[PDB]
Amino acid sequence: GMTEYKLVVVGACGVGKSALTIQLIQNHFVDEYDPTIEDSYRKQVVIDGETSLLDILDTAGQEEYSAMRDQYMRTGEGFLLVFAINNTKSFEDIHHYREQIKRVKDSEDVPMVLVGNKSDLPSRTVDTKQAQDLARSYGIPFIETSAKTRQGVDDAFYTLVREIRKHKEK
Ligand SMILES: *CCC(=O)N1CC[C@@H](C2=NC(=O)c3cc(-c4ccc(F)cc4F)ccc3C2)C1
Ligand SMILES: Nc1nc2c(ncn2[C@@H]2O[C@H](COP(=O)(O)OP(=O)(O)O)[C@@H](O)[C@H]2O)c(=O)[nH]1
Ligand SMILES: [Mg+2]
């Protein structure tokens, strides 16, 4: 058979939410994608031998409340918390996005994965160990990605699916 998963990608403007999503759905690096476009994208993949349909909300728009976004967030099964390893502000912004997920879900038990994107860049400002400290504090996995090289992209999304499977067993 197959399982559907409703996934959400959150993070600061410019961290690579769209680039990561397009790497999953189309398998290449799209370096210019309208920063204002918020949409959901469907892709059929196979995860641990099971046909898996991923619906992925690629967040954009504004920081303020959007009704359609909120109603999608409320029913999201798993969230990727994306920062860029060369942007300390995007890392500091993770707390903000995680709080909004907990506020909109009725749960302190929401599948999430912390994603350090742009791992290909030499201009790192956030140490892997700092990200590991934070993911540990949340009790969630940390995955390093490059939407440019596709390094870690399947690991980020498939790890989130594995976290949802574990949550559904409870
Ligand atoms: C380049 C522009 C861009 O990508 N952004 C501008 C606003 C930024 C933004 N990112 C988010 O991830 C986000 C998430 C939420 C939200 C809503 C509901 C919920 F349960 C959790 C959330 F994290 C609201 C606003 C934004 C704004 C991205
Ligand atoms: N070098 C590098 N650039 C990236 C990576 N991911 C995204 N980008 C670039 O970072 C910018 C923002 O990407 P985008 O997907 O629009 O970010 P979003 O605002 O979070 O949707 C664009 O110029 C992308 O080309 C990456 O992993 N490595
Ligand atoms: Mg985008």
Side-chain angles (χ1 to χ4, degrees):
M2 63 111 117
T3 305
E4 295 204 350
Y5 301 89
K6 187 163 183 178
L7 312 181
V8 182
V9 185
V10 299
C13 184
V15 298
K17 299 184 305 295
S18 294
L20 283 169
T21 301
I22 298 163
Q23 272 288 16
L24 196 288
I25 65 163
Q26 291 292 345
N27 311 298
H28 69 293
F29 178 49
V30 170
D31 69 345
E32 286 178 66
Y33 197 80
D34 191 333
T36 70
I37 290 175
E38 180 166 287
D39 205 1
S40 57
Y41 303 85
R42 169 156 315 119
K43 175 69 158 173
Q44 175 269 124
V45 300
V46 180
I47 304 170
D48 303 316
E50 187 173 70
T51 307
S52 305
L53 191 52
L54 312 190
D55 199 28
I56 304 158
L57 180 61
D58 173 27
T59 305
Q62 301 304 323
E63 288 289 324
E64 293 97 300
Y65 178 84
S66 163
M68 298 78 82
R69 181 166 55 209
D70 196 63
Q71 285 193 356
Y72 200 105
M73 298 273 182
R74 280 185 184 286
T75 53
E77 292 181 278
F79 301 74
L80 290 189
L81 312 173
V82 184
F83 72 93
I85 60 105
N86 71 322
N87 194 299
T88 299
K89 182 55 164 46
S90 72
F91 181 67
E92 292 169 353
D93 288 346
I94 292 292
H95 172 81
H96 164 62
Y97 294 122
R98 175 160 173 282
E99 280 310 311
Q100 275 209 72
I101 296 165
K102 295 194 324 198
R103 180 175 68 198
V104 166
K105 306 290 282 164
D106 211 345
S107 184
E108 206 89 34
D109 204 25
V110 176
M112 305 178 206
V113 173
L114 185 65
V115 174
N117 190 43
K118 309 200 185 184
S119 74
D120 56 285
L121 290 181
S123 46
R124 169 182 297 272
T125 65
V126 181
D127 199 284
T128 293
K129 297 183 275 200
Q130 193 180 0
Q132 287 176 332
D133 281 355
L134 183 65
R136 183 175 296 277
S137 80
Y138 296 161
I140 69 176
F142 171 60
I143 299 293
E144 308 174 46
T145 62
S146 172
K148 185 154 173 187
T149 69
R150 209 169 188 281
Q151 180 271 304
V153 171
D154 292 335
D155 288 345
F157 285 99
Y158 293 12
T159 298
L160 184 55
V161 164
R162 291 179 192 117
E163 289 294 297
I164 295 161
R165 285 176 178 160
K166 275 194 306 180
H167 186 257
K168 287 164 79 188
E169 289 182 328
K170 285 170 185 140

